[model samples]
Target: TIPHLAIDPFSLDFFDDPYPDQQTLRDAGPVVYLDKWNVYGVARYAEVHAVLNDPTTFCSSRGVGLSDFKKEKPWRPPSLILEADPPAHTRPRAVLSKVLSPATMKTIRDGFAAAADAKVDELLQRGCIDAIADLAEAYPLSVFPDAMGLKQEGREHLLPYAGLVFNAFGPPNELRQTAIERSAPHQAYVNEQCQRPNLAPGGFGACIHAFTDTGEITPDEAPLLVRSLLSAGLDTTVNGIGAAVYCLARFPGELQRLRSDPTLARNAFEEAVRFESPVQTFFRTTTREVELGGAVIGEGEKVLMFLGSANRDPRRWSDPDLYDITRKTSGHVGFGSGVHMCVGQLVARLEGEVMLSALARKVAAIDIDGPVKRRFNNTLRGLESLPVKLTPA
Candidate 1:
């Protein structure tokens, strides 16, 4: 292991555009030792897919977070679904999947869609807005909390808490430092609400409790599993909607394209996520020493997967970086690929589709007026702010 590798992934060289370094690494071979981060990364598409899919070989057992699971203390318990491999990962995933299947989501589509539309209409009426904070963040915070049955008291704390989580995956740094400072006060409440009784009736929390009661998962695991939903659920979708808005605003023609065909909102959202790639990178641990595309990975070493790089790799995409709603490259690695792929993607997609379509219905044009700021985390690519003026429809 390279001692003291570049842990500062948020450096200007990386944030400006990470793809150049990514391409260089991919060209060098699949797994290139990142001098600064000290971790060898799987830069090529094929190796990334292989590592993520073959959980046994790559091993999620060590924890997907930067810290090894064997450490006496971990930042938080590993995500039962996100950080666990098959067998162990299977039941929790199955239970939650059974509860949140796409078909089940469809039952509430009208409500979720309407909630999004109402929020967008409210924002458009207000005109120029921080589309990210005012609309994108507002929409999911409204929908998911209601769905999860969190009470009013700590509901406002959800977003910042999720921020603590995604950043906490990396080593302690300024980003993590910022999140910890902001969220430390509410961490206990966030933990307490995961209890079976605390989650109101008919939400994901209750469902998880039922799963535990049925022996699908142990009662001991309930809090950690519920924490997974709370952690993974909020900010990712919030930024997804944010990124979609930013993309359409940057490429107004695509907004017009979406407006002309409102159904394109779904395509537009997924496409924006594809183009910008909200989730930049995540790491996979190599089990046995593995060699691929010219680099030898030591056993127990972490290999970072550049999802953003894979999304932009010209070999996989045509223009690669252009914001075309119809641009297709066998779908981007934004939601990740293979078994550990995001189980909650549809939740995000639904929110984006509803909100963007609502904007299309109510806004004549959506354009960013101020410089868009990047909220960079080691794993998540998020928008800090997007100031946009909405032309009333």
Candidate 2:
């Protein structure tokens, strides 16, 4: 029998600060049953990676959230690719894979880089700025909407809707309830944006719609596919930027290192992801009864994989807690793993590289100018406010 932990990892205390409980969870055993949530958790690096890679055995189709889609009505339409299994996951994944492929990434690179440079130039005019608002959130919000060809008005709804989507992956607690209420209008707005005419001609949204001509996906699926792009594409990068800024602020030496070697911009972002994983937790259900680390989990049981804990697990990384740009982060599950791995990861890397590189080129140093407040999400680890003072080079 697996050891039962009395603690609830999704509780307010854990959300506020998870490091202690994460460490406790990893130390408890290879797999610990959370009696409070009645779930099994794997926080060690090996197990987390295994679960992520073996999506067939530990599936995503049932639902990645606490409320299984097979058993309960989804709060909204399920993400075609995200909440899908193999035969169903294949085509949608392919469409997005092609959309965010290397060739397509190059097209947006110059444009995204130009946008980053402009944003950095604008921010530099003010010596001190809230890195979260002024830099991280602002940069992504500016370019991504235009990239998707979304109209200027009501574009603000993107963030809250993304928040609600991620929040729903957890228990329908106060956090999830509040997000539902807050994102109601934004959610409807996002759904409307998914329609063909609502999107501009030469954007990812339009590109997803084009897949319908290929006949692998239908016209109805087109909007939801675009919905996937709109929902997942934005906040992850925003919080990724915030995480990089936060990491740089805390580790000024790393900032100087990045400045000294400008090529390290990509590495800096990657390291920040490993250091402060923005999308912290994801759940997968056991397809059938399976034994893991000498224990059997029954079919359809929920297994919470702590990507945040796995990234920091000492067994897989040397000095895992330290944020060092020089360290190899190729295998980090920050963007996830397997066939269901984050399809938009390349897009995220391009954005992170361009923005951080532009800042490294133009800014001298990033200093913490005030107290930082962390945003608690059921899934994401990011800042509500990050006050920073940047000096010009």
Candidate 1, residues 1-393, lDDT tens digits: the string is: 222234345565576667676767667665667666567776666777777677877777677766677653666656778878788988888877776778768876898988988887788678878987898788888789988878878787787788788787766667776777777666888889988779888787777787786767998787777788888888888878888888878888888888888877888888878877777777777788876665567788877777777777777677877988866545578888777677788787888888878877777787778888877775778788899999987
Pairs that collide, model 2: none
Give the TM-score of each candidate: 0.93, 0.98
What C-alpha lDDT do the candidate models reach, one value each?
A: 0.77, 0.89
Worst 10 residues of 1 by lDDT: 1-10
- TM-score, prediction 2: 0.98
Query: lDDT per residue, candidate 2, 147-187, as tens digits?
Result: 88899999878898898888889887888889887877998
Model 1, residue 221: distance off in Å is 2.1
Worst 10 residues of 2 by lDDT: 7-16
